[PDB]
Amino acid sequence: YHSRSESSIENFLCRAACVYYATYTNNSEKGYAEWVINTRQVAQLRRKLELFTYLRFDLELTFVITSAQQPSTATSVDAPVQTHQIMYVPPGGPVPTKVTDYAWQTSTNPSVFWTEGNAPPRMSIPFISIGNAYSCFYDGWTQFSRNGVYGINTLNNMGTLYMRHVNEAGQGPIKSTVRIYFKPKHVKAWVPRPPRLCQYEKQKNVNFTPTGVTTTRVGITTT
């Protein structure tokens, strides 16, 4: 007589979660931002995903982009509305090195242009793993000699996001922050794993500092 609908894997994971945010200012040629895509830089979504060993899902991407006026000396700063470009560069593709780089032509790379004041941009991504499922944990190495990189980072080859101001700089600098939100959809999960107990320490491995199993009480009969 009580349904378990809200404890489904879908309902548990199909909620948008911030995975990273980056900043960039319009006052330099290096005024762009980059982020190597990964789900291990935030505690909450990482812990939710790491309840399982293997996952297979589609992804909904939503960006929240906000700007702030930086100090300036010009009288009467009056800036038009700002337009932003976010470009996805799959591994092996050319990467931008400056705001006015030729790589922003995005002839084949998927890119999104969005103007401030509108609804947040949003796009969908399919399951893009070379394997049959995403891996949350990998007890192995990248090299056949068992030297070098050990762990889950060997399987992270998902590419890089690049972000920049489209508008040319005006009479005052503008600093913008882009917040990236991941929402898994059509999720399939396998091999449940104990929830993470020790606090996370690093992005690329499972390193931890030992912590007690629970909080304590005075005696075995204390209520």
Binding site: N11, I125, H186
Partner: peptide
């Protein structure tokens, strides 16, 4: 509407509920 897919890709569909 009630349920109509607007896109040609399955990844575009809403969640499985």
């Amino acid at each position: 509407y009630t349920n109509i897919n607007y896109y040609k890709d399955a990844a575009s569909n809403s969640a499985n509920r």
